[PDB]
Symmetry: C3
Subunit: 112 residues, 3 copies
């Protein structure tokens, strides 16, 4: 009787409660007009769909913290411990300054 009453085969499969993946694609298209949402409903959105779906919900991509560069904000590693200076001569004061410089160089806080 459903064959006598309905022409569309995708509708008929829905009414029989047995749909193929192709029937489901067509039925999705009857229910939703946004192309990126149709991409989501397929379970296999294209690259363009993915970008647009994130825009649609205001989502970001997985963020990876980059190392600091001389031009670009980034993360650093924390420098090793450095002892306060008790230097009473120039040689030792210079030794202590250099220890700080190396620590900051080791942590990528300043350039080599």
């Amino acid at each position: 009787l459903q064959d006598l009453l309905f022409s569309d085969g995708n509708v008929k499969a829905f009414l029989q409660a047995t749909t193929t993946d192709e029937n489901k694609t067509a039925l999705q298209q009857l229910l939703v007009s946004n192309a990126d949402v149709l991409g989501l409903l397929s379970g296999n959105p294209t690259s363009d769909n993915k970008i647009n779906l994130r825009t649609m919900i205001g989502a970001g991509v997985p963020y990876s913290l980059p190392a600091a560069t001389t031009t670009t904000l980034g993360g650093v590693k924390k420098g090793a411990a450095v002892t306060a200076s008790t230097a009473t001569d120039v040689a030792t004061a210079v030794k202590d300054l250099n220890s700080l410089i190396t620590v900051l160089k080791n942590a990528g806080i300043i350039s080599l």
Copy 2:
């Protein structure tokens, strides 16, 4: 015959395989209860929907 068999106009448009954007909104509502997901299916979620979809 579909006019004699079904009262709901959005259902009838689905059965004719020709739906407007308004028919699609109503059919989405028959299929999904979560308001934020309905926002996503519209392609135009509200600010609140977007926050809730990310949380989801």
Copy 3:
């Protein structure tokens, strides 16, 4: 959809890249003796220690 989780910036460790706090102000040195030069070096060290830029 290629989305990430909410990102929280971790503090720098000796093994892992992270954020730091900016160090307090430090005056340029006008030292003419060793004692003062050492005082100024130590002021820089403490500032960097206070901001978690270098380890205690």
